C-alpha cells in the first residue's frame, strides 16, 4: 500500500512516459500542447503541458522523447521513449558493462544505455539548464518506460548535483549497471528515484544478474493484473538491493505485463 499523494505522482509520470511513444510528440514545435491519441495521457492534457523541445532519433541508439513545461503541476519534465518494438531487445546482446567512473567510483553501466545518454548529454543538459533558469521554482522530473526508464535513470544520476534536485520515475526499466551503481542509486542524493514495476514483467528481470547487473532499492511493485485499474492498495514497497518478492521472482514472465503501467503504455503510435 502507498499514500494517495505518491499514487497520484506515479499515475501522472506513467502518462508522461506513455506520451513519449506517440510519434507526433517527437516532432512538435516548442509551445504546442502535448496530446495523446486514444486517451493515452488524459492528465498530461488536463495540465495543459506544452513542449520546450521534442527530439526523434538523436545521437546514438535512437534517443527519442520530449522536454515539457507543465504550469498546473509546476514541473520541467524530461521524458524518454523506450523502444518501438519490445520483442527485439529481449534478443539484445549488448549487455557489456562500461566504466562510468565520472558518475561514481567503481560503477559500471550498460553499454547501450550509457553510450546513448552520452551522445545527447551536451544538448539535453543545456536545454534542462535553460528551463531551470527561466522557471527556478519548478521541480525537475526525468521519466520513461522500458528502455526510456533506463535512460532517465542514467541521465538523472549524471546531472544531479548541479544546483537543482532531479526526481526520476521509471516504469518497467531493465537493470542499468553493476552492484556499485545500484548502491550509489540507493543513497538517493540530489533527488529521489522511484523504480516502478508490474507483476511478472520480463524487462525488469534483464539483463541477467550473472552478467554483473543489480537493481537499486527500493522497488514499488504493482500487484494488480494486466488491463485492471490500479488502486493505491495494489502497490507494495520492497526494500533491499536485488530483493526478491516483487518483480524479481522465479515464475514465468510476461511481455503484455510490460505494457500495462496504470493504463496502456508503449503502444501509443
Q: Which residues are catalytic?
A: 146, 201, 258
Peptide bond into 207 cis (omega under 30): yes
Give the chain's end-to-end CA distance (angstroms, integer): 33
H or E element at residue 16? helix 4-19
3-state secondary structure of 130: helix
- SS3 assignment, position 194: strand
d(CA 237, CA 10): 13
DSSP class of residue 257 equals: G
Determine whether 11 is exposed, middle or buried from the number of CB atoms within 10 Å of its CB (0-12, 13-18, 19+): middle
Tally of CB atoms within 10 A around 258? 26
Sign of CA dihedral 122, 158, 94, 24: negative
- CB of 156 within 8 A of CB of 191? yes
HSE toward the beta carbon, residue 166, CA cutoff 13 A: 24
- Give the span between the Cα atoms of 107 and 153, in whole angstroms: 14
Length of the chain, please? Answer: 269
Contacts of 134 (CB under 8 A, 6+ apart): none
How far apart are the C-alpha atoms of 229 and 262, rounded to whole Å?
Answer: 6
Amino acid at each position: 500500500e502507498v499514500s494517495q499523494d505518491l499514487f497520484n505522482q506515479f499515475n501522472l509520470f506513467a502518462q508522461y512516459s506513455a506520451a513519449a511513444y506517440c510519434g507526433k510528440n517527437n516532432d512538435a514545435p516548442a509551445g504546442t500542447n502535448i496530446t495523446c491519441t486514444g486517451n493515452a495521457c488524459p492528465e498530461v492534457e488536463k495540465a495543459d503541458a506544452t513542449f520546450l523541445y521534442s527530439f526523434e532519433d538523436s545521437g546514438v541508439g535512437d534517443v527519442t522523447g520530449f522536454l515539457a513545461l507543465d504550469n498546473t503541476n509546476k514541473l520541467i519534465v524530461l521524458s524518454f521513449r523506450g523502444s518501438r518494438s519490445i520483442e527485439n531487445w529481449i534478443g539484445n546482446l549488448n549487455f557489456d558493462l562500461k566504466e562510468i567512473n565520472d558518475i561514481c567510483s567503481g560503477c559500471r553501466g550498460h553499454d547501450g544505455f550509457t553510450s546513448s545518454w552520452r551522445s545527447v548529454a551536451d544538448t539535453l543538459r543545456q536545454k534542462v539548464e535553460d528551463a531551470v533558469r527561466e522557471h527556478p521554482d519548478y521541480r525537475v522530473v526525468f521519466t520513461g518506460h522500458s528502455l526510456g526508464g533506463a535512460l532517465a535513470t542514467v541521465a538523472g544520476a549524471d546531472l544531479r548535483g548541479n544546483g537543482y534536485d532531479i526526481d526520476v520515475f521509471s516504469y518497467g526499466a531493465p537493470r542499468v549497471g553493476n552492484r556499485a551503481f545500484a548502491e550509489f542509486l540507493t543513497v538517493q542524493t540530489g533527488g529521489t528515484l522511484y523504480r516502478i514495476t508490474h507483476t511478472n514483467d520480463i524487462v525488469p528481470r534483464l539483463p541477467p544478474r550473472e552478467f554483473g547487473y543489480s537493481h537499486s532499492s527500493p522497488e514499488y511493485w504493482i500487484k494488480s493484473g494486466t488491463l485492471v485499474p490500479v488502486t493505491r492498495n495494489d502497490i507494495v514497497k520492497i526494500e533491499g538491493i536485488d530483493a526478491t518478492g516483487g518483480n524479481n521472482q522465479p515464475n514465468i514472465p510476461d511481455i503484455p505485463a510490460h505494457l500495462w503501467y496504470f493504463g496502456l503504455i508503449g503502444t501509443c503510435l
